[PDB]
Amino acid sequence: YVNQEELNYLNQLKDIIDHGVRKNGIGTLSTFGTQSRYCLRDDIFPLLTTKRVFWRGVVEELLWFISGSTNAKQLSEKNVNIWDGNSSREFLDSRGLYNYEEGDLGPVYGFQWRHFGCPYSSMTADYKGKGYDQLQQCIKMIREEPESRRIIMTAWNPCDLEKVALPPCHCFVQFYVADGELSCQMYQRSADMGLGVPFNIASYSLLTRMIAHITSLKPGFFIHTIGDAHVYLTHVDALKVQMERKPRPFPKLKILRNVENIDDFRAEDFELINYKPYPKISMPMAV
Amino acid sequence: YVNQEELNYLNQLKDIIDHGVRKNDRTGIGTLSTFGTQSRYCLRDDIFPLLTTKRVFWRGVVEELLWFISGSTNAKQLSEKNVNIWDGNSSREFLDSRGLYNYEEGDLGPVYGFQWRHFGCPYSSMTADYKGKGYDQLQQCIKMIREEPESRRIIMTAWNPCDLEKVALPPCHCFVQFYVADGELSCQMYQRSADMGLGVPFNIASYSLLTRMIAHITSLKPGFFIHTIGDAHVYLTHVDALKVQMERKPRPFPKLKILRNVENIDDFRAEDFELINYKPYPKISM
Ligand SMILES: *[C@H]1C/C(=N\O)NC(=O)N1[C@H]1C[C@H](O)[C@@H](COP(=O)(O)O)O1
Numbered sequence: 001y002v003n004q005e006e007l008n009y010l011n012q013l014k015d016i017i018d019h020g021v022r023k024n025g026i027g028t029l030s031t032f033g034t035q036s037r038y039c040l041r042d043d044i045f046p047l048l049t050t051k052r053v054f055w056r057g058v059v060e061e062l063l064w065f066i067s068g069s070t071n072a073k074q075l076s077e078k079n080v081n082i083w084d085g086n087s088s089r090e091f092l093d094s095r096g097l098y099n100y101e102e103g104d105l106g107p108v109y110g111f112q113w114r115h116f117g118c119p120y121s122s123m124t125a126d127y128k129g130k131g132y133d134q135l136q137q138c139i140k141m142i143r144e145e146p147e148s149r150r151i152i153m154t155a156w157n158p159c160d161l162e163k164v165a166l167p168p169c170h171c172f173v174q175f176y177v178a179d180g181e182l183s184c185q186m187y188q189r190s191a192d193m194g195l196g197v198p199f200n201i202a203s204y205s206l207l208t209r210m211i212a213h214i215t216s217l218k219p220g221f222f223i224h225t226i227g228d229a230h231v232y233l234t235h236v237d238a239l240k241v242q243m244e245r246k247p248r249p250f251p252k253l254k255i256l257r258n259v260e261n262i263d264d265f266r267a268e269d270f271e272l273i274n275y276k277p278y279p280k281i282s283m284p285m286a287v
Numbered sequence: 288y289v290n291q292e293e294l295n296y297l298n299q300l301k302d303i304i305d306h307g308v309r310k311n312d313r314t315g316i317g318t319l320s321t322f323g324t325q326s327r328y329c330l331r332d333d334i335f336p337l338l339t340t341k342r343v344f345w346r347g348v349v350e351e352l353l354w355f356i357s358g359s360t361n362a363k364q365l366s367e368k369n370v371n372i373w374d375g376n377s378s379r380e381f382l383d384s385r386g387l388y389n390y391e392e393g394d395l396g397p398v399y400g401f402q403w404r405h406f407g408c409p410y411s412s413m414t415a416d417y418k419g420k421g422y423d424q425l426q427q428c429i430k431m432i433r434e435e436p437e438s439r440r441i442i443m444t445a446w447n448p449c450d451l452e453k454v455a456l457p458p459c460h461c462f463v464q465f466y467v468a469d470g471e472l473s474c475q476m477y478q479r480s481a482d483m484g485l486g487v488p489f490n491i492a493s494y495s496l497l498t499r500m501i502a503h504i505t506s507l508k509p510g511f512f513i514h515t516i517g518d519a520h521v522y523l524t525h526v527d528a529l530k531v532q533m534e535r536k537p538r539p540f541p542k543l544k545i546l547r548n549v550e551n552i553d554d555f556r557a558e559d560f561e562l563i564n565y566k567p568y569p570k571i572s573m
Pocket residue numbers: 166167169170190191192193195196197200439440
């Protein structure tokens with residue numbers, strides 16, 4: 001067996017490492033404009049196998065996004081620390097966000113998805129009923145106008161850029177319905193191919209499965225489009241090791257309950273079948 | 288001589304026509320469709336991707352883009368330059384069908400130009416004074432290209448869900464990112480909905496021209512235009528005409544020369560652009 005989708009990812013890593021352009025004083029190798037397709041049919045789920053992906057973090061982060069939260073403490077208290085570095089006192093101060101409490105990411109993903117256009121005050125404020133709920137509107141359009149070419153969720157509001165700890169990387173999403181199947185395309189302005197991309201593929205494939213479930217559709221495809229696709233120079237050796245590994249079949253993902261609505265999912269609803277990755281890679285310095 | 292980038296476009300037409308999904312659509316005409324495509328067009332050596340297997344309305348590309356840049360949403364300003372491409376979506380009849388009863392004819396609502404130059408400003412009408420209002424994304428992108436060319440955040444969006452009830456037609460070409468490496472400016476545009484027959488050739492030219500303009504004013508060389516599409520479709524009414532086009536071996540693209548030094552994006556004029564050796568096959572109307 002050969003996992004063509006994962007091999008394609010490894011081939012894109014190889015193209016960046018061997019032929020990418022240096023961009024900086026910390027350095028990357030970079031290319032601009034890539035696209036990959038991941039088949040979600042038969043419940044196959046594109047969780048990469050050549051290096052273990054932090055699946056628990058994928059699930060918890062996505063449920064947190066869906067809830068509309070921008071409070072990284074809520075995620076950290078669930079033992080997922082991936083947003084703690086971008087919401088520390090030191091990082092916030094470095095962005096000039098001196099009045100934000102630690103944990104306040106500003107109006108990032110969850111807020112844009114559920115409350116677009118609402119003025120942001122802080123992560124603890126009530127936003128219920130405020131702003132444009134793009135996530136619910138997309139679900140509505142999938143069900144009411146599946147032919148639509150306008151089923152869009154944006155995370156990009158230039159008016160909010162001064163208020164965010166980090167501008168959203170995964171910033172534009174479109175859904176599509178054909179032949180009883182739901183597909184999703186996500187546009188990512190900036191992608192760390194080594195650490196971010198595998199996690200991000202899983203996040204949006206999971207979102208697609210969740211929405212397909214509550215819209216009574218079968219899963220189609222996840223299409224990942226990238227602007228600046230890059231690898232950090234310090235990671236090149238670890239990625240060279242990873243590229244020598246043989247991808248295994250992807251796992252399957254099952255949803256174990258008839259879930260009521262997009263806000264009703266729980267971590268325990270998701271079963272990953274036969275996920276057998278290689279271990280995470282750590283390369284000691286030698287020079 | 289053969290043109291590989293145009294051959295790729297023709298191959299995409301063939302795949303949609305032979306294998307696309309039949310969709311009903313907003314217009315009621317019906318389409319063959321695929322979801323998720325990407326193509327790259329090289330802008331090096333002044334080569335300019337104006338398709339050759341049919342004539343593209345170049346004068347309309349230029350005038351429409353200068354109009355976008357100005358921030359205008361008044362289709363009468365284009366129509367008065369004998370560019371009628373937005374007249375159908377801004378007639379009294381169409382505006383009334385969208386519930387836009389108080390718009391004067393010509394008012395497209397807060398579409399491309401308004402979003403590029405005035406994002407977030409409440410829209411009233413096409414004739415209101417928006418000078419200095421909203422977020423000038425176009426000028427901010429140019430500033431970032433000049434001052435922080437390595438940035439991974441050089442973005443212009445045309446999508447504001449809060450404005451969707453005010454527009455005649457929601458923007459099709461709706462997200463743009465710029466990128467600088469090795470002294471070359473590239474641009475990727477995301478198009479949620481692409482009429483492969485009529486729209487796409489025009490849209491490729493529009494964003495390639497914008498990339499050339501911005502490279503020129505920032506003293507960069509042009510790199511690539513990357514076109515990413517959501518719903519790429521062919522209207523059933525277009526299939527026969529597109530079958531004529533797919534039988535043609537594309538010719539090499541023209542070159543585009545910019546004829547004077549221009550320092551600000553708002554300073555370009557139509558006569559600054561010279562299209563060299565554009566040699567299209569006989570026109571195909573749809
Ligand atoms: C941004 C965040 C993400 N998911 O939330 N995925 C990513 O891969 N990233 C990476 C891209 C880049 O290396 C860095 C963001 O820095 P810039 O804002 O300068 O692009 O994080």
